[PDB]
Design a binder for these strands. Structure first.
Ligand code: AU
Ligand code: CL
Ligand code: CL
Ligand code: CL
Lengths: 232, 226
DNA sequence: CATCTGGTACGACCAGATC
DNA sequence: GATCTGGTCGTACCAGATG
């Protein structure tokens, strides 16, 4: 429920996801929709606007607010809010998101070395004074990839990880719980620190592409115990 | 100038980019800030919300809206309203951008083959009925990668490629102009197309990293003139 | 409570799109 | 122009946070 705005948001959202105001179609006049929902127009706008931004609507002046298939207008800044709608199909998602900061990582981790290998070390060094409990770990892990990202020199790789964070640490606070994983991830970290000094670029794609499978097997073995939109 | 909100926002953002409301700091009360800029609280509110979302502010109830190190809470969705402010360092950025759409593609396109090769086709096919001129060409260029990403099975890459669209097109809309560019691009798409029928995976990272530098040279050789 | 700061509510009006 | 639809305005009031 929440407060008017939150309700109206949470509402309008559901209404899309649930083919009520199916994607690709007009959406009621702000006045009509207002009363329908039970908030005031203004309070509606606020909601309409912030949504518009995420990637749902697409407001224009005289034109009516039209809804959108978000995989066509929306950045990683939705993932989270997506995992919360498609309750059933999430293992799929995270699986994907993982097999991404992975593949991708390799690119910018390599670069992070060639340029700025000095700072690429100021990051992998944090792994010393960290805490040991999952929550504090996740926050570090994600803090490392991101850190490097900017380090590879190309900030875009940052703005990306940046978008990930959300659903990227929720997994963290979870997977990491298993100290067995805190190990592999750590060893992993320090295994690499040494390459900035041992400038062995090559010895990247090798690592990650398995640290991907490795850590993965750990997660898959931590799970084995427990509607609109498309894309194509 | 523009409309209140368009302006009222144009303002709030710029003032962040140029320390008037430095990051980590709090920012004026709605009543006060409103009066200050010239729009109505109402109108302001609209702006502050949409702003929050992109990542700038961080509105909480009682507590005072605080600004943020957007470098920590913002995604590609700003690339646009950045290159627009730092109109000095622009090339470095674009360069970065292309030098990303590059490295990334190699991963997902490759993937787009092993799974869904049949569709990786219906896409590179779009490269026939297109049109010549830059404009419509840019659209295609972007759309192929995007097309490919999705077809790659892992839509997340779509999101990203989706988030770059804005800026990644403004580059297309200028680069492609000089046909010598369109050529390379076509020989490129087409180069791949056949590979979908030749399923020779390993033969991808090669062409991309290349085409990256290549198209690049062409684009770099379009800058040093103005 | 007094008082910051954000959140809502109406209601009259301005402005782009459309045919 | 007549009339959809979104954009702005102002004001009086409600609600969370803090001394
Ligand atoms: Au080093
Ligand atoms: Cl808008
Ligand atoms: Cl959860
Ligand atoms: Cl100015």
């Amino acid at each position: 429920a929440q407060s008017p705005a939150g309700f109206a948001e949470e509402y309008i959202i559901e209404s899309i996801w649930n083919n009520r105001f199916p994607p690709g179609t007009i959406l009621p006049a702000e006045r009509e929709l207002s009363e329908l929902i039970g908030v005031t127009r203004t309070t509606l706008r606020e909601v309409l606007q912030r949504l518009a931004r995420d990637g749902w609507l697409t407001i224009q002046h005289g034109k009516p607010t039209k809804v959108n298939n978000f995989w066509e207008t929306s950045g990683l800044n939705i993932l989270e809010t997506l995992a919360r709608l498609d309750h059933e199909s999430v293992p799929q998602l995270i699986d994907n998101l993982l097999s991404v900061r992975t593949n991708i990582s390799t690119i910018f981790i390599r670069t992070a070395f060639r340029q700025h290998p000095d700072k690429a070390q100021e990051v992998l060094a944090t792994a010393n004074e960290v805490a040991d409990h999952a929550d504090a770990f996740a926050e570090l892990d994600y803090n490392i990839f991101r850190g490097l990202a900017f380090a590879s020199g190309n900030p875009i790789y940052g703005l990306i990880l940046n978008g990930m964070k959300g659903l990227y640490t929720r997994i963290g606070r979870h997977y990491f719980a298993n100290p067995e994983a805190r190990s592999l991830a750590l060893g992993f970290y320090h295994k690499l620190s040494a390459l900035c000094s041992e400038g062995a670029h090559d010895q990247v794609y090798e690592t990650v592409r398995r640290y991907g499978h490795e850590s993965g097997e750990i997660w898959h073995r931590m799970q084995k115990n427990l509607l609109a939109i498309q894309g194509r």
